[PDB]
């Protein structure tokens, strides 16, 4: 009740009437955390299809979802008549052939942040047997634990006024000389007309 | 020039082979079978060397003769043309028989354990993906699919997550359908189960909705997921999807052939009210028959 | 040679009483021995129903996707290759789980025990008192997550009661139940991390993807044969992980003793491509992400950096360094109220200063 | 009498190539027949799952009290 502009409403992602009442025409993000089988991978069947319906009704809307199984991440935004996304299946099979644990990695929705799986937290716990700091680092980045004097994860847009900084190293130099911020990485976007 | 039983050292070579199997293959039960042959070889090879050397004092058996003597012994044939004629040779046969009867069964039980836990083609096939396969659905496909002479060289792979039905099992045991129908327990959503089905080589894939399920939206979601999984794995495989609810029909529009059950059911029921027995007319037309009834 | 059915015939009964005795003894053998055999079969039927440095994995139901995730991550490390895994699960082994365990790679490494952490006998069979670590993982497929969290709290208590000196790695579903397993060495609350990452994705796009790749052990070899330039870079950069090293022992950062944190971070990246993201002073146990320019580095600090390879495991690039053998960063440095949310929903909720409504 | 393991011995191979042939013939017997036996076991396992004037009793579930 103390937070500004936090509202609630009754409905679901499968009810288009409720979604239009929420303001989905004016929504930057639509986060779906909906929870709903004997065959294991079918547990996400309702969430995948419901999200797919909105992907077709609102193609420009940004939908972020959580899936039980990383194998189901290929079904986030499914273009069956798309040779590129169908070729990604061959790439992921090759990576699975070489024994890579990150085979879902090259799926477009995961790479764009549209999907993540909760099985990753399992890997975080197993990693903690070797990296006792890993849980603490993750929560510090997520802001889950707040230590006085510890930084927070943010993002900066590189607009056309900042292209005179040609490379990522020069951006590291400029940030560390003015605001003392440390770049973790880049979120890159390319033109990929489908 | 002293006698040293180097032949018993062959047993240790078998042990050195057992620890080999733990690390590299070169086939899970094949290794124990190979081990079983090894201890059989050690059993025989110890028998030949022991009998040949102990008979060196009496009757002076050759190695080839003792090998034949040993083989007909552990096979319980016991011809008796060549027998141990001295007490230490007779005793060695006794302890070799006893050693055989206490070593071989241990290998047999390890074989039995592996076999128990293990218990739990040509070209131009088609895959049939269902959630539960019943005899009514299977025979309808089999009657229609093999009513054509062109598709007689085809075999059918059934990819179904559920365990094979008892009624379905009996029909598959029939020699007509034994060689034509393979039943795979697996999911279209697991690429490994799609590799076992050879979906990348299948002539066609039939994704059929489950109508017995009380939740038809859930069933339609599963077939949409199955159709996507097959399209993702094998893009150049014609999909034949059976959809229950019309609202879910545009999610599988990419499929080569889609049948919506609710549309056809209610349009035929409505036409029966306009044109009597339109459902009967359509039914006979879509059934392959020679007009001999 | 008689009861073995060899029947050599070199020695034979030559009189009728001896021949009859052999006949009756053969018959007695064939009617007495099978009775012993059937009793043995009866015992065998009902009977059907290692090394050092192992790890116990306590779950309520083990499915293939959970097992392989553990197996891939656990054995991705060369240090943990001599380790074997005990799975303590009340449920009967899954058919899919059985097939993977039959694989020779996992046959000797994984033991599956059907039992409960709440029975000390099942903990003795698991050798929990000797286990290097115990992983208590909640079941998320269960429709009642409060019930599942209660079971993992009980499991964690049972393991702590039986084996106090065994590091507990607990996976908790609901945040309200997280302070009951605070004693555990490492605790992961699923709901906290899930919703914080989902919220960060709304602020920083693909934060969940960034975190996912970092917490996954990889060598950065994915998509290296890809013709696409973005796939090669993306698969390469995914090999980054977070590592820690004492600064004095660190060839990356030892030259920056007495320099500011941001100075070392920029220059170690410019020189070696490593991202100094945080440090832990020797005095405190708190890890600080980007302490800032006023922070002065010292040899006793533990530096946390992002890099493709561990510094010790990067012994090649240092030898590869020997194969070769903008303002500058300085060495030395209605309106809303700002306050804490009054009613914390649960215990353990870290207080974050937030934009708050005046009323 | 050889393949039945009786081995009377009244007629036995008296030269080496026959003794070898009997040895190899026993070996092929012990490696070919079990494969047929195993196939017989599989068929038997999957197989496991009158006069005049009879009467049929059709029920949905038969219990001992009704029978
Ligand atoms: K790495
Ligand atoms: K990584």
mmCIF file of N, CA and C in Angstrom, chain B residues 49-119:
data_model
loop_
_atom_site.group_PDB
_atom_site.id
_atom_site.type_symbol
_atom_site.label_atom_id
_atom_site.label_comp_id
_atom_site.label_asym_id
_atom_site.label_seq_id
_atom_site.Cartn_x
_atom_site.Cartn_y
_atom_site.Cartn_z
ATOM 1 N N UNK B 49 45.770 -76.670 -19.026
ATOM 2 C CA UNK B 49 47.130 -76.627 -18.500
ATOM 3 C C UNK B 49 47.278 -77.505 -17.264
ATOM 4 N N UNK B 50 46.281 -77.491 -16.377
ATOM 5 C CA UNK B 50 46.353 -78.329 -15.191
ATOM 6 C C UNK B 50 46.351 -79.810 -15.525
ATOM 7 N N UNK B 51 45.447 -80.225 -16.413
ATOM 8 C CA UNK B 51 45.378 -81.632 -16.802
ATOM 9 C C UNK B 51 46.600 -82.047 -17.601
ATOM 10 N N UNK B 52 47.055 -81.200 -18.523
ATOM 11 C CA UNK B 52 48.234 -81.546 -19.305
ATOM 12 C C UNK B 52 49.461 -81.709 -18.418
ATOM 13 N N UNK B 53 49.647 -80.803 -17.456
ATOM 14 C CA UNK B 53 50.852 -80.847 -16.637
ATOM 15 C C UNK B 53 50.776 -81.918 -15.554
ATOM 16 N N UNK B 54 49.600 -82.132 -14.963
ATOM 17 C CA UNK B 54 49.497 -83.164 -13.936
ATOM 18 C C UNK B 54 49.549 -84.562 -14.536
ATOM 19 N N UNK B 55 49.149 -84.713 -15.797
ATOM 20 C CA UNK B 55 49.238 -85.998 -16.478
ATOM 21 C C UNK B 55 50.590 -86.225 -17.139
ATOM 22 N N UNK B 56 51.520 -85.286 -16.969
ATOM 23 C CA UNK B 56 52.870 -85.416 -17.537
ATOM 24 C C UNK B 56 53.583 -86.610 -16.962
ATOM 25 N N UNK B 57 53.202 -87.012 -15.766
ATOM 26 C CA UNK B 57 53.773 -88.202 -15.143
ATOM 27 C C UNK B 57 53.043 -89.469 -15.570
ATOM 28 N N UNK B 58 51.729 -89.380 -15.763
ATOM 29 C CA UNK B 58 50.942 -90.534 -16.145
ATOM 30 C C UNK B 58 50.136 -90.321 -17.410
ATOM 31 N N UNK B 59 50.434 -91.125 -18.434
ATOM 32 C CA UNK B 59 49.770 -91.145 -19.738
ATOM 33 C C UNK B 59 50.165 -89.977 -20.636
ATOM 34 N N UNK B 60 50.880 -88.993 -20.084
ATOM 35 C CA UNK B 60 51.510 -87.914 -20.852
ATOM 36 C C UNK B 60 50.564 -87.309 -21.895
ATOM 37 N N UNK B 61 49.503 -86.673 -21.407
ATOM 38 C CA UNK B 61 48.512 -86.078 -22.295
ATOM 39 C C UNK B 61 49.098 -84.886 -23.045
ATOM 40 N N UNK B 62 48.783 -84.793 -24.334
ATOM 41 C CA UNK B 62 49.147 -83.622 -25.115
ATOM 42 C C UNK B 62 48.181 -82.476 -24.828
ATOM 43 N N UNK B 63 48.613 -81.260 -25.170
ATOM 44 C CA UNK B 63 47.790 -80.086 -24.888
ATOM 45 C C UNK B 63 46.497 -80.104 -25.693
ATOM 46 N N UNK B 64 46.562 -80.534 -26.957
ATOM 47 C CA UNK B 64 45.349 -80.634 -27.761
ATOM 48 C C UNK B 64 44.386 -81.656 -27.172
ATOM 49 N N UNK B 65 44.904 -82.789 -26.693
ATOM 50 C CA UNK B 65 44.045 -83.814 -26.113
ATOM 51 C C UNK B 65 43.419 -83.348 -24.804
ATOM 52 N N UNK B 66 44.206 -82.696 -23.944
ATOM 53 C CA UNK B 66 43.666 -82.193 -22.686
ATOM 54 C C UNK B 66 42.648 -81.084 -22.916
ATOM 55 N N UNK B 67 42.816 -80.298 -23.982
ATOM 56 C CA UNK B 67 41.822 -79.282 -24.311
ATOM 57 C C UNK B 67 40.490 -79.925 -24.678
ATOM 58 N N UNK B 68 40.532 -80.983 -25.489
ATOM 59 C CA UNK B 68 39.318 -81.731 -25.792
ATOM 60 C C UNK B 68 38.768 -82.404 -24.543
ATOM 61 N N UNK B 69 39.655 -82.915 -23.687
ATOM 62 C CA UNK B 69 39.225 -83.495 -22.420
ATOM 63 C C UNK B 69 38.525 -82.455 -21.555
ATOM 64 N N UNK B 70 39.082 -81.245 -21.496
ATOM 65 C CA UNK B 70 38.502 -80.200 -20.662
ATOM 66 C C UNK B 70 37.157 -79.724 -21.196
ATOM 67 N N UNK B 71 37.020 -79.595 -22.517
ATOM 68 C CA UNK B 71 35.776 -79.083 -23.084
ATOM 69 C C UNK B 71 34.630 -80.056 -22.837
ATOM 70 N N UNK B 72 34.861 -81.353 -23.070
ATOM 71 C CA UNK B 72 33.823 -82.351 -22.821
ATOM 72 C C UNK B 72 33.571 -82.576 -21.341
ATOM 73 N N UNK B 73 34.399 -82.001 -20.468
ATOM 74 C CA UNK B 73 34.177 -82.121 -19.032
ATOM 75 C C UNK B 73 33.226 -81.043 -18.529
ATOM 76 N N UNK B 74 33.555 -79.773 -18.779
ATOM 77 C CA UNK B 74 32.715 -78.678 -18.312
ATOM 78 C C UNK B 74 31.383 -78.612 -19.045
ATOM 79 N N UNK B 75 31.257 -79.291 -20.181
ATOM 80 C CA UNK B 75 29.973 -79.456 -20.846
ATOM 81 C C UNK B 75 29.215 -80.675 -20.341
ATOM 82 N N UNK B 76 29.771 -81.387 -19.359
ATOM 83 C CA UNK B 76 29.167 -82.553 -18.719
ATOM 84 C C UNK B 76 28.931 -83.708 -19.686
ATOM 85 N N UNK B 77 29.589 -83.698 -20.847
ATOM 86 C CA UNK B 77 29.474 -84.829 -21.760
ATOM 87 C C UNK B 77 30.167 -86.057 -21.179
ATOM 88 N N UNK B 78 31.405 -85.898 -20.716
ATOM 89 C CA UNK B 78 32.147 -86.987 -20.107
ATOM 90 C C UNK B 78 32.393 -88.258 -20.895
ATOM 91 N N UNK B 79 32.970 -88.123 -22.092
ATOM 92 C CA UNK B 79 33.088 -89.258 -23.003
ATOM 93 C C UNK B 79 33.786 -90.438 -22.341
ATOM 94 N N UNK B 80 34.858 -90.176 -21.599
ATOM 95 C CA UNK B 80 35.599 -91.230 -20.945
ATOM 96 C C UNK B 80 36.695 -91.862 -21.774
ATOM 97 N N UNK B 81 36.890 -91.421 -23.019
ATOM 98 C CA UNK B 81 38.018 -91.916 -23.801
ATOM 99 C C UNK B 81 39.343 -91.446 -23.215
ATOM 100 N N UNK B 82 39.370 -90.243 -22.648
ATOM 101 C CA UNK B 82 40.534 -89.709 -21.953
ATOM 102 C C UNK B 82 40.087 -89.367 -20.539
ATOM 103 N N UNK B 83 40.659 -90.046 -19.549
ATOM 104 C CA UNK B 83 40.324 -89.827 -18.152
ATOM 105 C C UNK B 83 41.594 -89.657 -17.334
ATOM 106 N N UNK B 84 41.524 -88.926 -16.223
ATOM 107 C CA UNK B 84 42.674 -88.863 -15.313
ATOM 108 C C UNK B 84 42.948 -90.224 -14.693
ATOM 109 N N UNK B 85 44.181 -90.697 -14.852
ATOM 110 C CA UNK B 85 44.567 -92.026 -14.404
ATOM 111 C C UNK B 85 45.359 -92.018 -13.103
ATOM 112 N N UNK B 86 45.592 -90.849 -12.509
ATOM 113 C CA UNK B 86 46.318 -90.743 -11.252
ATOM 114 C C UNK B 86 45.529 -89.851 -10.305
ATOM 115 N N UNK B 87 45.766 -90.048 -9.007
ATOM 116 C CA UNK B 87 44.988 -89.334 -7.997
ATOM 117 C C UNK B 87 45.101 -87.810 -8.065
ATOM 118 N N UNK B 88 46.277 -87.187 -8.247
ATOM 119 C CA UNK B 88 46.277 -85.715 -8.302
ATOM 120 C C UNK B 88 45.583 -85.167 -9.536
ATOM 121 N N UNK B 89 45.574 -85.922 -10.637
ATOM 122 C CA UNK B 89 44.788 -85.520 -11.800
ATOM 123 C C UNK B 89 43.297 -85.688 -11.533
ATOM 124 N N UNK B 90 42.915 -86.793 -10.887
ATOM 125 C CA UNK B 90 41.516 -86.996 -10.521
ATOM 126 C C UNK B 90 41.041 -85.917 -9.559
ATOM 127 N N UNK B 91 41.880 -85.569 -8.580
ATOM 128 C CA UNK B 91 41.518 -84.515 -7.640
ATOM 129 C C UNK B 91 41.382 -83.167 -8.333
ATOM 130 N N UNK B 92 42.261 -82.869 -9.293
ATOM 131 C CA UNK B 92 42.203 -81.578 -9.973
ATOM 132 C C UNK B 92 40.890 -81.435 -10.739
ATOM 133 N N UNK B 93 40.419 -82.519 -11.362
ATOM 134 C CA UNK B 93 39.119 -82.489 -12.026
ATOM 135 C C UNK B 93 38.011 -82.210 -11.021
ATOM 136 N N UNK B 94 38.109 -82.785 -9.820
ATOM 137 C CA UNK B 94 37.073 -82.589 -8.810
ATOM 138 C C UNK B 94 37.020 -81.128 -8.379
ATOM 139 N N UNK B 95 38.179 -80.547 -8.057
ATOM 140 C CA UNK B 95 38.196 -79.152 -7.628
ATOM 141 C C UNK B 95 37.875 -78.219 -8.790
ATOM 142 N N UNK B 96 38.209 -78.612 -10.024
ATOM 143 C CA UNK B 96 37.858 -77.779 -11.170
ATOM 144 C C UNK B 96 36.357 -77.806 -11.428
ATOM 145 N N UNK B 97 35.726 -78.966 -11.238
ATOM 146 C CA UNK B 97 34.273 -79.047 -11.351
ATOM 147 C C UNK B 97 33.612 -78.217 -10.259
ATOM 148 N N UNK B 98 34.109 -78.330 -9.023
ATOM 149 C CA UNK B 98 33.551 -77.549 -7.923
ATOM 150 C C UNK B 98 33.777 -76.056 -8.128
ATOM 151 N N UNK B 99 34.968 -75.671 -8.593
ATOM 152 C CA UNK B 99 35.238 -74.262 -8.868
ATOM 153 C C UNK B 99 34.324 -73.754 -9.975
ATOM 154 N N UNK B 100 34.097 -74.580 -10.998
ATOM 155 C CA UNK B 100 33.205 -74.193 -12.086
ATOM 156 C C UNK B 100 31.786 -73.967 -11.582
ATOM 157 N N UNK B 101 31.304 -74.854 -10.711
ATOM 158 C CA UNK B 101 29.931 -74.772 -10.232
ATOM 159 C C UNK B 101 29.723 -73.677 -9.195
ATOM 160 N N UNK B 102 30.792 -73.068 -8.681
ATOM 161 C CA UNK B 102 30.650 -71.967 -7.735
ATOM 162 C C UNK B 102 31.045 -70.620 -8.334
ATOM 163 N N UNK B 103 31.728 -70.607 -9.475
ATOM 164 C CA UNK B 103 32.115 -69.350 -10.108
ATOM 165 C C UNK B 103 31.126 -68.949 -11.195
ATOM 166 N N UNK B 104 30.724 -69.895 -12.041
ATOM 167 C CA UNK B 104 29.817 -69.630 -13.154
ATOM 168 C C UNK B 104 28.446 -69.116 -12.712
ATOM 169 N N UNK B 105 27.800 -69.708 -11.695
ATOM 170 C CA UNK B 105 26.503 -69.159 -11.264
ATOM 171 C C UNK B 105 26.566 -67.705 -10.834
ATOM 172 N N UNK B 106 27.668 -67.267 -10.222
ATOM 173 C CA UNK B 106 27.789 -65.858 -9.857
ATOM 174 C C UNK B 106 27.755 -64.968 -11.093
ATOM 175 N N UNK B 107 28.420 -65.392 -12.170
ATOM 176 C CA UNK B 107 28.322 -64.664 -13.431
ATOM 177 C C UNK B 107 26.908 -64.728 -13.996
ATOM 178 N N UNK B 108 26.238 -65.873 -13.839
ATOM 179 C CA UNK B 108 24.876 -66.017 -14.346
ATOM 180 C C UNK B 108 23.918 -65.061 -13.645
ATOM 181 N N UNK B 109 24.049 -64.915 -12.323
ATOM 182 C CA UNK B 109 23.146 -64.034 -11.588
ATOM 183 C C UNK B 109 23.385 -62.576 -11.944
ATOM 184 N N UNK B 110 24.644 -62.200 -12.170
ATOM 185 C CA UNK B 110 24.925 -60.862 -12.675
ATOM 186 C C UNK B 110 24.314 -60.666 -14.057
ATOM 187 N N UNK B 111 24.331 -61.712 -14.888
ATOM 188 C CA UNK B 111 23.610 -61.659 -16.156
ATOM 189 C C UNK B 111 22.113 -61.503 -15.925
ATOM 190 N N UNK B 112 21.568 -62.240 -14.955
ATOM 191 C CA UNK B 112 20.135 -62.184 -14.685
ATOM 192 C C UNK B 112 19.734 -60.793 -14.211
ATOM 193 N N UNK B 113 20.530 -60.198 -13.320
ATOM 194 C CA UNK B 113 20.230 -58.854 -12.839
ATOM 195 C C UNK B 113 20.247 -57.843 -13.977
ATOM 196 N N UNK B 114 21.255 -57.920 -14.850
ATOM 197 C CA UNK B 114 21.330 -56.992 -15.973
ATOM 198 C C UNK B 114 20.160 -57.185 -16.929
ATOM 199 N N UNK B 115 19.775 -58.438 -17.181
ATOM 200 C CA UNK B 115 18.650 -58.695 -18.074
ATOM 201 C C UNK B 115 17.345 -58.177 -17.486
ATOM 202 N N UNK B 116 17.163 -58.325 -16.170
ATOM 203 C CA UNK B 116 15.942 -57.833 -15.537
ATOM 204 C C UNK B 116 15.825 -56.322 -15.668
ATOM 205 N N UNK B 117 16.882 -55.597 -15.302
ATOM 206 C CA UNK B 117 16.843 -54.145 -15.385
ATOM 207 C C UNK B 117 16.873 -53.647 -16.823
ATOM 208 N N UNK B 118 17.285 -54.488 -17.775
ATOM 209 C CA UNK B 118 17.210 -54.104 -19.179
ATOM 210 C C UNK B 118 15.779 -54.169 -19.696
ATOM 211 N N UNK B 119 14.944 -55.017 -19.099
ATOM 212 C CA UNK B 119 13.569 -55.189 -19.544
ATOM 213 C C UNK B 119 12.653 -54.055 -19.102
#
